[PDB]
């Protein structure tokens, strides 16, 4: 089926699929159900940064979320990548909305990957940074109800004329090239990734949340993802 | 048809077809007849870079081609791209043998191409570097007879499974993503693309060429676009 | 005395040395009359950016200045700067008022410089990037009135505490490493500078600009150069 | 007296002082007993990488040394560098020499640090590389018997006119700017840096080694320090 290794920033607590009681940032390894996750106080209406880095010397995927004048919430996790992730992959932002909702507004988003070889001097990089997103982004793969130029913004989720987001959605942007992220070869190969986004809920409860997954190249929302699946997993096993 | 804006580093002299006398480098706006050229003393066996620059404040296409310890060939033509190219392109690397031939063999190929909107620090940016090319290289679309992998090279025309080049041979290779080199509200949008080549003819009289081109999205090899028309266009006009 | 080359962001008329009769941006070449002058229609009070490139190909230096929403003033000057600056130098930012003032405040400043030899892929290169400045700055070195620290700001003339600019002020600051410029067995050398900075007066006209400098590594503002020198020249010759 | 964080490439193996009785790297934080070393099989005659990198949020330091086509040698020491350096330091290399020899070229060498502070979007970058090292690189602070531009690289110790390495040699290269290594105010701060280096023993047995090094920006070679002190530290404790 497919492949997903996940940074969630999930706003609502479903205890149910073991979810802490409180907003949280996870890493997800296949499966909804965080291997490793850290409480998160999310601001409602403001502008927050997520940072996500990995090496293979390391061996240890990491993630900080903040928002300016604020403590960070951080979450790390030791995964040897080459041993979940097919070699080329997809890389993306991921949102849902169900019964309670929020804007998953992504205001900008970069991405490089590296890998060195070992081979003197070579290495080979993907870079790129989008600070505003066109109307027609043709370098990117839009899935589900994620729209891009609505004030130079992407939409992961549905947002009604007016500014309210709407329930029961999900959206997704992959970038359209394949990413090598590992190779066997390769002495150091290692990615970093930054989005900032404004989750806005005009009620007591946001909901669902916002991903940075890496998936296999050929990617689809799986049915029913709505909610808390994140439009990521299939099931909440 | 195919809107293609290239730079050529024409190795044989097809003077019915307006190459000058010698081997030389060019700039192609939509014809292989090139608007400008410049006298290139091609250095059979030995390994070159080729440099092109270009900038939207000063509209100037430059290339400069240079073998380590030798004369430098370069060539400028002033042409305002946002009137000649789509804004949305995918740039590659072409090449050929017609009679006569050579390997045409790509070492190593980076590009970076940058938007600044008017917004201050949006910077939209694309960044690749390809030192060493994988036998199944995901994000290269290669069209005709190129092939990644032997010597972790592109090899962009065929070679004999002995090392040697072979005639009427033609390849193409693209990077995956689109790329926005343009864009209307931009304030500066550039692009710098560099790659390293190995030229070896085993005969006297080396053909066709090497070529950095820019097209439109949907660009194939043109049919009979062999030797001197360098696998980019359909006729010779 | 110092080997000045500068992109003057010139908001005073001193039509008696040659300035045009309304703000403009030039090229000066150790002079404060400008080789090359474009209108510039400066908005008082807002964030501007300014963009500054350079190739030793086409030996063409170009600054283009823009405010959000507008239209932007470019002005371009061939000239080779190996004829011009010594192999190393210094980069920096420079500012002044007289009978009238302005702050003179720089929020951002970047700066990338590469130099490529002809031996292959040997490119040396430097970059540093500011979107912030502390009170204890120790890369910069800052000259006359220029104080970092104020809100995150350098200002690069006197502000007092209540927020006014004051008259017969000049202030500069200069990256700490000196740069490699130009070198002769380079193939190619570029660099390309880009800050944002904010002119606000509350007086009539303000007055008198800021100025991107590049110099010989050793240069110190010349004495009485307040208003219409900029902080860079002597005299007005 | 000084602060020293370095990444040494040991050579040569003083058992009396805790060192493995083979050629090793190792994490030194303030002493010459490393807290942590790898067996590094060190290959005489031939051109090695290492890569360093480290980041706030693991604070994890690690360094990979490796060979063309052989394998690596890693190592990781965790360790809060807010609490050991200076937020403003200098980086650089350390090379000696003492009853035995080697050389010691540095053929290139590259270092990127990056600081986000409690501010959206505003990262402080300083990125320096040098893939040839000229007479009068005015961008080094040479220390001790280093020199650059014999061959176009960085002899950190001495080497007669013929090529031959001599003994009780010290010498270090440091960049000129202070680096801002951490900040209170800092989401996440890293940096990497990277060397090619060629190890050559004439008299069989190599001694004593290359360093990386992180210092206060005033940072001098300890009287002594030849041999098996790396020209860093002050005594064997
Ligand atoms: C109350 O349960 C519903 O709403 C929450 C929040 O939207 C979702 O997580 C969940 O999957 C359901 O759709
Ligand atoms: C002589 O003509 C043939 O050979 C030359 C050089 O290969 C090609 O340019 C041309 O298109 C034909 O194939
Ligand atoms: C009136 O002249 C003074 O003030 C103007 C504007 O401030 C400056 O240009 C000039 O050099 C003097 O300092
Ligand atoms: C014999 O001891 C000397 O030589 C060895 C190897 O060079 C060094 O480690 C040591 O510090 C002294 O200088
Ligand atoms: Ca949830
Ligand atoms: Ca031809
Ligand atoms: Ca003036
Ligand atoms: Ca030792
Ligand atoms: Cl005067
Ligand atoms: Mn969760
Ligand atoms: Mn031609
Ligand atoms: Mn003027
Ligand atoms: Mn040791």
Redesign the interface.
Known sequence: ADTIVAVELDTYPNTDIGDPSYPHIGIDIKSVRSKKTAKWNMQNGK?G?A?I?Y?S??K?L???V?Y??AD?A?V?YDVDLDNVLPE?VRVGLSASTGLYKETNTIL?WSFTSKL?????????????????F?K?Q??LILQGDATTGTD?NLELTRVSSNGSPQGSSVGRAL??????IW?SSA??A?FEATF?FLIKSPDSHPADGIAFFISN?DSSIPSGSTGRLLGLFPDAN
């Open positions: 502008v940064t940072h880095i090496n010397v390391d240890r990491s993630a900080v903040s300016p004048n960070s951080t790390s080329w900008s060195k070889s070992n081979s003197t001097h070579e290495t080979n990089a993907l870079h790129f940074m989008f600070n505003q066109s027609d043709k370098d130079g970038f359209y090239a394949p990413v090598h190779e002495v150091v290692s900032t190249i």
